[model samples]
Target: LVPRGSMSDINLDWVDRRQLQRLEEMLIVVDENDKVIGADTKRNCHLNENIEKGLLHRAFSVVLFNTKNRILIQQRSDTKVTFPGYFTDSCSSHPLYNPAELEEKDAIGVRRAAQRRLQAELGIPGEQISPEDIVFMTIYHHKAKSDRIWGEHEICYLLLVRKNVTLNPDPSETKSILYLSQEELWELLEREARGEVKVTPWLRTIAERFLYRWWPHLDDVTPFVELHKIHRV
Candidate 1:
């Protein structure tokens, strides 16, 4: 018999074991203008390496809100090296560019990146959480903390999603996930500042900027974009 508390049966297999064996993703190193300068592995660009010759790159972060405007977030797995165990936005990752595609169409890269991480990290289906679910929000260009261990020198493109989406956390990539209202998030942020909690620095910066600047004026953009599937490892 199917017992109660069906939510307890969440899938936690994470990505296939092969997913863990995949090599570090190649990031498009960039200038402050978001112009491609070169390419580097995601690993070599983290921690102090990002601080020392800051290979400013193109990255993306996605935020999700329910009909009630509640935010959905995830706690990254402790095994993650960069900002491990930190509570972050719905998705945080990089956009990819290809020689076959038009360079000006950078949004395409962002869409694909969003599509990928959402599926890889959260167990969200690729078809349902397509590019249509994303609406460009703003750009965040900032430096990491003084230690530079997990700092970012990226031109991170931010996007918003207002969808009734379902998510199942994969234990390999995430420790936990939750939805928080604006007020609740603020309280968490307050606690985070007091060293009682940890939040992704970039997300903390972006969310605060949104709460104070954009949310009131942001328009609904469900307009869709087609995503090109990547066959790479």
Candidate 2:
């Protein structure tokens, strides 16, 4: 009963209102090529589920920063199914298919997704930004959240913008936004990494990695470091 082009392999039955509310919590199965194969409706994929089956959709989450090395983080709206009101990177979203049925797996698609997310989330225009300002960072898989039944295989990126960009968040997706210095961000991340702070597993991993590796390289790019001062406190 699965639709030919649906994102999942199994044809999901007409779920009731209660189950429909948990659509984001369903686990999707995939083939070795990462194509959707089947789906599991279980709430937990780590503890009570198995993953030795096949491949799945890969996601991208980006962290954007302005010239001052101040990290941009957003507060997810309280109505969001995942991490509502939680603070996260500047732009993070899943790539979607285009009108021509083109898969969002190519380089162009990835770039477009990132660009579109900025516009959709912050109303930032893509033309104002250049590709050279972005850097491909690391990727991480977070299986900590019990509510994430769909199971995300995410590829995370860190984007550097050497400008003082104003933030205008869409109220539907975000509640608030802020720019934090590297030191302050690291302090918060450190606490989270050590289980002291509440955050998504992927966010914790990105925070720890950024604190050590990518953060130091900020000085090499003059425009970014000079504009924002590192807060010692």
Candidate 3:
């Protein structure tokens, strides 16, 4: 087995990847009779294929935008086993699962997960963001080149910021990052569609299917303040 966290630890023999079927069991919150209650786990819970068997969790993410209507994108670090160096939206992460003895609440789980990803990835803290800011995006269940399958049911959100804020990509997880105006981004997506720009299948699909629908609406139909409260000192 490769030494844990070493440069040669890319294979499944490493301590972190050495699980039966490469599946890591999660601690699900449950009640009596071994029913699920709530779920919690460390980051990158699905890194090992065996640990993910028969277990399902929701993935949450956000697309951060600036006053100029430009969106921030990040390139995954080359060290990643899947789609390394591919550019993606601002943030992405899995929702917390209910524990082993508890029942899962899909709605609550997705909301909390989305909020956590925004804070963890962008250092933005607040629930002031509107529900419209978070659209019920599509779900994807696919496999990776590493022989790992993504049986995820994802809920994607788009968070718009009227102010200009600096981005700090987590260097350990990401390589380079950039901000692009919607027009420029659309042009880039077109090139990607034409087989010019290399990108992940999911990124390409999202750009083609959802990008146009993401154009800002004129009226704020959804009540932001009623849905969530901003953090106070």
Cα-lDDT of candidate 2: 0.52
Q: TM-score for all predictions?
A: 0.78, 0.63, 0.58
Q: Report the lDDT tens digits of candidate 2 across residue range 108-223.
A: 45455667667777877666654445444433433334242333432333344445566666776777887888788778777776877455556556666554466667655443
- Top candidate when judged by lDDT against the true structure: 1
- By TM-score rank, best first, the candidates go 1, 2, 3
Tens-digit lDDT string for candidate 1 (1-233): 33435653332233344333432667778877667888876655554544466567777788877777777888987656556678989888776546532144647667777877888888888767887677765676766652333456677777787777778766667889888887788788898999998888876776675644545433553332213321110
Q: Per-residue lDDT of 91-190 in model 3, one digit per residue for the tens? A: 6655445432122343345555555555555555544443325543334433333334222322222233344555544554567767877677788778
Considering TM-score, which of the candidate structures 1 and 2 is the better prediction for this target? 1
In model 1, which residue pairs have backbone atoms overlapping below 3 Å?
A: none
Q: How high a TM-score does candidate 1 get?
A: 0.78
- Scored by TM-score, the top model is 1
